[PDB]
């Protein structure tokens, strides 16, 4: 049985100290210190060498990413990217300490976005008639001058009729997942989350790619150079083969929506996820998916019974930096 | 003798408040209940009642505007929209996440789409799926504590405080088999592109139950998008299906098309939005296509604090130009389970006659 | 076992059916289902005679109230007077249908100030720099010009005045209680809650009650009359006592903070309430008592453990007034 | 072609932001790990981060304007506030509710109290108790979903995933009784008029404890509020000690005078809110006595859309006076327990050797 107590100040500003006495403060802190014990977790199994038999069985996909004991599927919402979380996890795909990314649309553009131009701080209440007179959009209390997307669509256009002269005359088959590496590839840029992802074989899936700037690119595009298609039905078995042919699997899911039941959808081909932290701001009491506590998902099979997930209810952008300083930061050494 | 500053600073003076101003007053039940006169009283409630109220005023708006006659050519509409639903006065979209399909707001939504009262349907895949399991096996009421280990055992799946067995799946699974045979044979050899909102349609027909939104859907030519149709059972069942009849493509370049030509040709739009997330977002930028919806409803259970899109605020998406600055949108925090059939009620099933 | 489905409006707009089919609903919907049974539980209850050895055991307090089966505790937050449901409030005390009121300050002030001067409507985004240069007061979405306050200052100064003589002359030993019934008389006005809940005997507990205007005119006031004395202590007294005494104990918790618990603290000197609804849009995730479940309470014996409590997540606003239309409301004539 | 109007809605031009425009970017971890660094970053962050780095700097600004010498009549003073604690430059209110006294914020508030950081503190009635009952027995972690029914068997009882036994109250009661048994017989025959933060100071003494929050504010001539003291196990005692003891009475109006004049005769004052409720209001409107505080941090989990006055932003407290029109109030929308202790690690405890 643990005892409640905090941080002591009289001991000086010790910060590792200080973060590592979160899980003996109670309510949300103490949740915090369990997801660094669940991640920890994850990492320590992804450590792990592989038997001879389990090296035979993760080895039966067509996957060029090396076998690892532990599978790590890493879920963003958009707005994450907008966010300068969007350096936190360029950092763990750069050093390959996850595997799979899921993100919306939002998720994929703004972070080719960002290496063309910044966005800004702002604050929630500027009002946005006197922001659109400007065009000025507002992201929470973030924000993106329009002259961003109109650089996208220079950058982008090109790129898609490439894109479908090879659908054409070379016999490509696009998905979502196919269009995300080659457009990591085109950025070339190191501060890219998507860069990053197709150098080190790390597919990114976003079945609702459609959903953004990036649709409204397509779109515009199609009138000229019609017939692209984005084939969703193959990167729906491209996600499940990665789960289902895992020697172990962890979830590190921030917010809701698409991207957290699609990782936990394809965690459920394998029976469930050995690790999962979901860090979000949804509550249950709507019966929504993003809102679902980890234990809803254990009634589906897509968690372990066997597992201890955890949940720690709080805007990612204040724990999720906290969470890789006392977990994958600490083991840099053993990625490189 | 009292501080003068602090006398100064709690008894400031005040200005009066323009003459139009609207006081504060609850429902008097000494009346009795006239429950149309309790729910016009929502409106100077207060809090989330009142803007409850301006809902109400806002989609009736819309409803007002959509009865409007129009003149128009249905050809070049039907050209550069690629559809066959004719025209009207105000195009509505109604988005819904796919728990609200889980729930009895699945009712709800089929009666709008029944009576041809809304234009474009968007929900996610669950929003697709449970409405034609629902037509093979009942979902059940339960409770949010149940513990998920017990339920695994006893093969329930729970959805926030509802259940669903596993044989529901089961019953899914063998009903949409051969209807994903027909459709590989029909894309190899007669040509089909198939997309989400293609292939809803097509079960809408096939389930041929009038309980079914999407059933009534596909007979009203209300077209349903989903642009990630694979983020739940019927992906499962794609997936396994494809193992053993390889082939199907599902498309979203062509499914966006179709949702943008709707807002780019429309003479007006409004947006009713239940959730957020993809349906939100979809709905909304499709609008931006136009500079912007003349009408918005959100009821969300949301916040703005953690910038997501699911969160924001109808003012932030003014900065976008997904809403126009002339609009008065509305946004009400709540579950819609509560609020949507209350405001149907006093807007849509109030207007019965003039949709037919 | 029941099966989800909503009302259909293919039958019309029959509204007591549409409000009958939230049960099946799901989500909060099926909440506030459960929330009319357990409110029409303890009305049924309330109705039901005392026994001989019943009233023996009820009949052991001071209080001047009628006997009852069921004693049913009223908790709202302040904010709650501000909007319309003051006007809900007031009907249930008129007719005799709680037997307890607990509220913070500003929901005893506000009732009074209503009688002197409305509320208006306004919205969430007013900016408060222009609001006060204009003496304009926000409550949330709602306005309450200062003026308002200058009309409470005319009215009650002259009550403390009599307060103050009747302690130092006539041995009145004043509590938020005592004060809050005579603030009622004094209001002599039908639109009130306070004038009905002294009329009728129904006690009103609020241990903070300088906690806001009606402080600030205390405070004002101590400096030309000096003295007054709140005694907290007894209040305590007073409210327990009526938990204790009671044959059987509902309670209806609109809101959270000092009210919620102080009912259900209450409610423990009885071993436990027999029925409780609450109706709040606080969450548990941060530990506070505000956001606790029902549950929680079972732990600590405010709540018996055979009890089958609710709560519904969402605005009382919304709420509020369609459970009354479906549970007191259709009882009106059993209460006069 | 593209729609001429959808382009242009789309790709509008924008106008160039100011040259002081901060970019976001978050913390690099190729860096290494440096947590002053890495809690720095928070600022450029976004969403609550940067309102976090907000919160430090608002704090940082009340902490820099106390530590600024004064000269100021300490006689005048003392008569009109009636207290013996010396006015500095800034007058800094600190108020939490009771679950927090509960988590390891406990641990967090008694430092900044042991050095004589802040000069008033506001809790409810079990944050009061159970910093006196934390001397006697320990807080326990669990989980929030442990069902009532079986802790209720055991005698334990739940605060959130906290747990305390049964026995932790029978101990309070055991060391409590005595000090009533005094303060009846001191307020009898010694004239002493009890109100609550009279009894919290002698609370305070008696517990001799330097773990708790109480004996370090008494020691320090720090002030606690509680106008709802009644509300908790320590009413609890009251009230059963009343019927052995009979008499002992707590005013609450002498308390309100006190706080008041805390703020009205202060050069400066800032707020430091930990949630919401009565402690959240009675730190505020004493402050609008003044016409407003001049720094202000609330850190809460509530929301506005209920018109709560938990939720209520801290512009809603401008309209009435509570926070002046020229301060740069935060709000941080988060639990206390993740953000309260960063907050003070890069704020007070930077500046310990001011302080001594
Ligand atoms: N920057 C953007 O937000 C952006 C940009 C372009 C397109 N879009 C589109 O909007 C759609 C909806 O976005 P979405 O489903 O990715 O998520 P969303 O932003 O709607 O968030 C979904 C849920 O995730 C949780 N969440 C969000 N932000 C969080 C935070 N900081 N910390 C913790 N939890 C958080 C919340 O509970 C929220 O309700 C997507 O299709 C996307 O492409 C978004
Ligand atoms: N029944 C299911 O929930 C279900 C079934 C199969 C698949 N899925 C998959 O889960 C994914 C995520 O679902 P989604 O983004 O459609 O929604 P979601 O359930 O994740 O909800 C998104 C947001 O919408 C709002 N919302 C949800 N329920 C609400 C209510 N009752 N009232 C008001 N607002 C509400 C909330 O703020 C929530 O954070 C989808 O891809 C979906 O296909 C869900
Ligand atoms: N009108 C006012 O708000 C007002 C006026 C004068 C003084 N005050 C003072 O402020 C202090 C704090 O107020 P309080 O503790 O009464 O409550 P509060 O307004 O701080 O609310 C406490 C909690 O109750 C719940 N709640 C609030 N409004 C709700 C709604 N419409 N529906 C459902 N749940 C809701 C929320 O979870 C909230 O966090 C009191 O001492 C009071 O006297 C308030
Ligand atoms: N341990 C306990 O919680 C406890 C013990 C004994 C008595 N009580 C009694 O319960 C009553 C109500 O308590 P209260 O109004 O002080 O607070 P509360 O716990 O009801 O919280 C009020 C509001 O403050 C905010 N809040 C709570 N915890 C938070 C956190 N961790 N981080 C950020 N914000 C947070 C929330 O919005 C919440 O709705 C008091 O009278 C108290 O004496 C409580």
Known sequence: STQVRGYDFNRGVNYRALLEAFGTTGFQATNFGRAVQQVNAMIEKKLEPLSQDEDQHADLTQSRRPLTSCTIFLGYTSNLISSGIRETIRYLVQHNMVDVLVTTAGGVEEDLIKCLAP????????????????????????????????????????????????????????????????????????????????????????????????????????????????????????????????????????????????????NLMRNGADYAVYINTAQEFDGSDSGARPDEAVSWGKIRVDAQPVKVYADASLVFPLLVAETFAQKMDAFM
């Open 119 to 266: 966005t800004y701080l702002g604050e929630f209440s500027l009002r946005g008639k006197e922001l659109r007179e400007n065009g000025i959009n507002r992201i929470g209390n973030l924000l993106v001058p329009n002259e961003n997307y109109c650089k996208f669509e220079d950058w982008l256009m090109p790129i898609l009729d490439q894109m479908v002269m090879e659908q054409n005359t070379e016999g490509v088959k696009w998905t979502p997942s196919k269009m995300i590496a080659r457009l990591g590839k085109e950025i070339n840029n190191p501060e890219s989350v998507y860069y990053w992802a197709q150098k080190n074989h790390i597919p990114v899936f976003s079945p609702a790619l459609t959903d953004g700037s990036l649709g409204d690119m397509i779109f515009f595009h199609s009138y000229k150079n019609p017939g692209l298609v984005l084939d969703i039905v193959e990167d729906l078995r491209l996600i499940n083969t990665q789960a289902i042919f895992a020697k172990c699997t962890g979830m590190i899911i921030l917010g809701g929506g698409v991207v957290k039941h699609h990782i936990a959808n394809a």
